[PDB]
Amino acid sequence: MRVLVTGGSGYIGSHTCVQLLQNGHDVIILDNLCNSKRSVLPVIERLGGKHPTFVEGDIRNEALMTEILHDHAIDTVIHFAGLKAVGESVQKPLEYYDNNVNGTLRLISAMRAANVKNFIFSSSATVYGDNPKIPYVESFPTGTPQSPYGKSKLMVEQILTDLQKAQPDWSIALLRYFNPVGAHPSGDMGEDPQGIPNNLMPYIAQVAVGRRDSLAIFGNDYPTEDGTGVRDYIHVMDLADGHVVAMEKLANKPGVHIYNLGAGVGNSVLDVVNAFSKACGKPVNYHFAPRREGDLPACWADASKADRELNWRVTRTLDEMAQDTWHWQSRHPQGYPD
Amino acid sequence: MRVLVTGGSGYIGSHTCVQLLQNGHDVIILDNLCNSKRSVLPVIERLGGKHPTFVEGDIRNEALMTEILHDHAIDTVIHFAGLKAVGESVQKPLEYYDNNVNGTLRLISAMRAANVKNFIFSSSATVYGDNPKIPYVESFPTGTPQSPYGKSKLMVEQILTDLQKAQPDWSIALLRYFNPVGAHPSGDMGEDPQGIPNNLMPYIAQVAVGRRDSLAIFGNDYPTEDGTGVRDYIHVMDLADGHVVAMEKLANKPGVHIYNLGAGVGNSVLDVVNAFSKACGKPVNYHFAPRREGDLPACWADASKADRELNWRVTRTLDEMAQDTWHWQSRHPQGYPD
Numbered sequence: 001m002r003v004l005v006t007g008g009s010g011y012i013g014s015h016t017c018v019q020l021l022q023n024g025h026d027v028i029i030l031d032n033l034c035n036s037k038r039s040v041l042p043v044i045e046r047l048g049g050k051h052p053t054f055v056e057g058d059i060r061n062e063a064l065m066t067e068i069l070h071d072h073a074i075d076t077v078i079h080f081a082g083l084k085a086v087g088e089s090v091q092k093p094l095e096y097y098d099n100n101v102n103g104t105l106r107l108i109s110a111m112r113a114a115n116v117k118n119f120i121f122s123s124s125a126t127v128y129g130d131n132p133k134i135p136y137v138e139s140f141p142t143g144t145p146q147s148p149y150g151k152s153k154l155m156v157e158q159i160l161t162d163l164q165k166a167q168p169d170w171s172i173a174l175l176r177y178f179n180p181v182g183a184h185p186s187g188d189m190g191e192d193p194q195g196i197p198n199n200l201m202p203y204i205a206q207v208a209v210g211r212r213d214s215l216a217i218f219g220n221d222y223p224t225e226d227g228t229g230v231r232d233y234i235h236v237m238d239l240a241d242g243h244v245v246a247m248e249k250l251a252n253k254p255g256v257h258i259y260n261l262g263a264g265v266g267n268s269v270l271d272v273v274n275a276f277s278k279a280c281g282k283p284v285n286y287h288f289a290p291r292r293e294g295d296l297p298a299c300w301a302d303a304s305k306a307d308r309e310l311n312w313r314v315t316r317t318l319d320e321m322a323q324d325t326w327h328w329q330s331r332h333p334q335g336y337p338d
Numbered sequence: 339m340r341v342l343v344t345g346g347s348g349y350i351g352s353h354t355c356v357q358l359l360q361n362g363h364d365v366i367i368l369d370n371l372c373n374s375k376r377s378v379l380p381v382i383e384r385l386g387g388k389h390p391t392f393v394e395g396d397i398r399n400e401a402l403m404t405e406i407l408h409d410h411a412i413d414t415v416i417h418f419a420g421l422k423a424v425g426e427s428v429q430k431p432l433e434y435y436d437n438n439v440n441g442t443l444r445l446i447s448a449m450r451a452a453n454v455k456n457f458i459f460s461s462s463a464t465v466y467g468d469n470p471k472i473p474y475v476e477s478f479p480t481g482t483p484q485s486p487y488g489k490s491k492l493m494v495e496q497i498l499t500d501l502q503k504a505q506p507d508w509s510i511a512l513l514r515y516f517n518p519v520g521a522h523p524s525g526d527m528g529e530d531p532q533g534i535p536n537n538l539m540p541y542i543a544q545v546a547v548g549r550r551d552s553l554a555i556f557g558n559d560y561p562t563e564d565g566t567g568v569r570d571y572i573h574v575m576d577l578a579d580g581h582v583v584a585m586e587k588l589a590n591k592p593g594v595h596i597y598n599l600g601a602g603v604g605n606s607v608l609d610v611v612n613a614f615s616k617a618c619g620k621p622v623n624y625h626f627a628p629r630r631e632g633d634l635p636a637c638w639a640d641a642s643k644a645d646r647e648l649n650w651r652v653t654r655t656l657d658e659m660a661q662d663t664w665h666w667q668s669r670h671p672q673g674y675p676d
């Protein structure tokens with residue numbers, strides 16, 4: 001298929017692109033480079049074994065989106081482009097609503113204009129909001145996310161859902177997940193966050209590598225086996241794969257297809273730290289801090305539906321998540337070149 | 339104050355503008371004319387006793403919005419611009435999300451750029467979603483609206499709320515209400531809907547005037563006194579007034595001010611039909627039909643908060659709503675001139 005991948009140079013997008021190319025699809029990457037560097041492009045092509053077309057631009061530019069779709073005769077679109085920092089979203093709500101909500105809107109308006117009707121949305125498990133019932137199932141109603149970021153994700157899901165109802169020939173997947181971690185097994189692609197990492201893994205990684213002094217652990221008095229918070233982590237390669245399978249199997253199958261992508265289990269903070277100490281060969285430094293306000297003691301997604309309907313399930317482990325991360329750091333200590 | 343009124347040439351906006359001008363504010367009307375005609379302008383000026391500046395344009399054009407705010411040194415903005423047809427929204431979701439959600443976003447992004455921080459949002463009681471607890475109070479959590487229109491309204495409320503939190507010096511009112519009806523007592527301004535009226539009143543009005551054969555009443559077996567659905571109707575002059583008071587008293591008072599605007603009581607379908615037969619001098623034709631799917635038997639807003647905090651309450655009656663409507667039809671049978 002001919003696939004446009006917005007946000008194709010980012011973390012999840014880059015790995016997905018490689019898999020797409022490996023499966024022989026024709027890939028067009030659209031990225032504005034606000035959170036990625038052109039230097040990943042050549043890596044993508046090399047690992048994918050095929051050349052992807054790159055277009056630097058913004059999803060908010062409806063005109064350019066239309067042009068692209070037309071020019072490349074796109075069949076389907078995998079949408080990763082947007083902003084995703086939860087704390088920053090509380091500080092700069094408008095940027096989040098413009099990139100995420102308006103950004104998706106402009107993008108699907110261009111699709112309509114170009115006659116494209118296959119869409120894969122990189123969603124978020126934040127949509128379940130504060131559900132005390134765990135694990136989360138696709139059959140659970142959505143809740144109210146707490147940050148502008150979470151809210152933007154739910155808004156886009158609703159917008160897409162109404163669009164499908166009005167244009168019943170569309171096929172739209174809403175892929176929900178929690179924490180993507182890990183890196184391509186080559187160690188030549190991985191997460192390259194700029195500034196302070198918000199996500200546990202990257203943070204742990206930076207402490208281990210010596211960029212940070214110690215990890216602060218938010219609470220040690222939860223009703224969990226070891227007293228630390230239990231979360232959901234998915235290897236970026238498993239996640240990329242899930243996006244590819246969904247794109248392939250859902251194309252031209254009208255409807256709104258909702259799927260949780262995850263391992264189907266939770267891991268504690270300590271579990272993740274220990275996996276990492278293990279991968280990097282030295283004890284990661286940490287200390288305890290108080291609970292982070294609004295935190296549940298445990299949370300994870302039920303991924304049965306995806307197993308059943310798409311025949312998809314994870315195949316990477318927590319240790320591999322830690323190892324592959326350390327492997328990329330080790331090989332590209334300064335990230336992607338400028 | 340210097341006030342920009344988006345959607346100033348529309349139904350609610352036109353009446354509001356007249357009141358603003360009467361109170362001596364300097365008014366700038368911004369309207370794209372998609373659902374109104376330039377011919378109301380001169381009426382507005384005449385009834386207001388002062389000249390309002392008119393600018394034809396779209397809220398989606400951030401550049402023009404910025405220019406305007408600057409040029410006219412705006413102090414506060416009353417935002418009525420958007421699309422509001424519930425059925426059409428189910429058919430054309432994207433237009434609703436673009437005009438309402440993106441339209442408000444572009445508008446508040448321009449305000450930020452121009453340093454304007456007083457906003458009055460014309461919201462909707464649809465935000466309470468399917469609350470079985472009546473009457474609805476501002477203290478009730480919001481629910482999930484059922485149509486794209488309802489949803490767009492809740493989305494904008496949330497966006498504004500997050501914006502205020504991030505920019506704490508802003509003053510933002512969220513004015514919620516149900517069914518605006520009626521007309522300026524001069525009979526020289528009123529609702530001028532094109533095509534089939536969706537709202538009960540306008541419909542009743544068209545049947546009475548002879549444009550339609552009969553009113554269909556959706557169910558006569560509800561658990562209400564007369565078996566027909568009980569709703570909330572507010573005279574457009576009372577509504578306009580509430581918008582003016584809110585603008586005046588809330589200016590420069592930081593926060594998100596939520597207020598329901600209504601009479602504090604419900605009226606049945608038959609009640610409204612009888613009021614109308616009364617105003618037009620002939621029995622309105624009607625027949626019963628089955629219940630409309632998703633309808634509650636009764637619904638209305640509690641307006642105590644506004645009485646208490648703004649010292650505002652309605653002063654027009656149901657009969658007046660009917661009379662003033664008939665009065666405008668009688669004087670301007672073809673609506674506003676082309």
Ligand SMILES: NC(=O)c1ccc[n+]([C@@H]2O[C@H](COP(=O)([O-])OP(=O)(O)OC[C@H]3O[C@@H](n4cnc5c(N)ncnc54)[C@H](O)[C@@H]3O)[C@@H](O)[C@H]2O)c1
Binds near residue numbers: 009032057123
């Ligand atoms: N728990 C969660 O919700 C979960 C966690 C991570 C990622 N995600 C989603 O996955 C997607 C990809 O995230 P990621 O982790 O790879 O982050 P990322 O920042 O590496 O990738 C996003 C890419 O989009 C680009 N981009 C941003 N705004 C753009 C715009 N307006 N036009 C064009 N390009 C634009 C950035 O340059 C970047 O390359 C996002 O939609 C994100 O919300 C969700």
Ligand SMILES: NC(=O)c1ccc[n+]([C@@H]2O[C@H](COP(=O)([O-])OP(=O)(O)OC[C@H]3O[C@@H](n4cnc5c(N)ncnc54)[C@H](O)[C@@H]3O)[C@@H](O)[C@H]2O)c1
Binds near residue numbers: 351418441462
């Ligand atoms: N129950 C409810 O929710 C309730 C019922 C009626 C009105 N409202 C709200 O009140 C407001 C005013 O409604 P109204 O009844 O006077 O309808 P209206 O159509 O008469 O007024 C809206 C005006 O905005 C203009 N407009 C539309 N999109 C625009 C855009 N993108 N740029 C500039 N101008 C634009 C139209 O030309 C029109 O003059 C809307 O926000 C509407 O949703 C809510």
Ligand SMILES: CC(=O)N[C@H]1[C@@H](OP(=O)(O)OP(=O)(O)OC[C@H]2O[C@@H](n3ccc(=O)[nH]c3=O)[C@H](O)[C@@H]2O)O[C@H](CO)[C@@H](O)[C@@H]1O
Binds near residue numbers: 086230
């Ligand atoms: C960084 C981020 O986007 N967090 C979001 C993530 O939370 P989520 O809890 O899934 O993931 P995080 O990476 O934020 O935290 C993982 C776990 O590690 C803990 N932890 C994290 C970082 C750290 O320095 N120390 C520490 O102890 C957390 O308390 C938690 O128990 O998705 C949730 C929605 O479902 C949101 O509520 C969160 O705001």
Ligand SMILES: CC(=O)N[C@H]1[C@@H](OP(=O)(O)OP(=O)(O)OC[C@H]2O[C@@H](n3ccc(=O)[nH]c3=O)[C@H](O)[C@@H]2O)O[C@H](CO)[C@@H](O)[C@@H]1O
Binds near residue numbers: 463517538541557
């Ligand atoms: C036209 C419109 O926007 N309706 C919206 C309005 O409903 P809402 O019920 O407030 O107002 P309407 O004008 O649609 O209907 C008023 C009453 O009259 C009845 N009626 C209406 C029209 C008609 O031809 N015959 C008839 O019998 C309705 O069943 C109801 O009992 O706000 C609600 C949100 O709170 C939405 O759920 C509705 O979709």
Ligand code: NA
Binds near residue numbers: 165166167428429
């Ligand atoms: Na339809």
Ligand code: NA
Binds near residue numbers: 334335336337
């Ligand atoms: Na670097």
Ligand code: NA
Binds near residue numbers: 090091503504505
């Ligand atoms: Na802040």
Ligand code: NA
Binds near residue numbers: 672673674675
């Ligand atoms: Na006319």
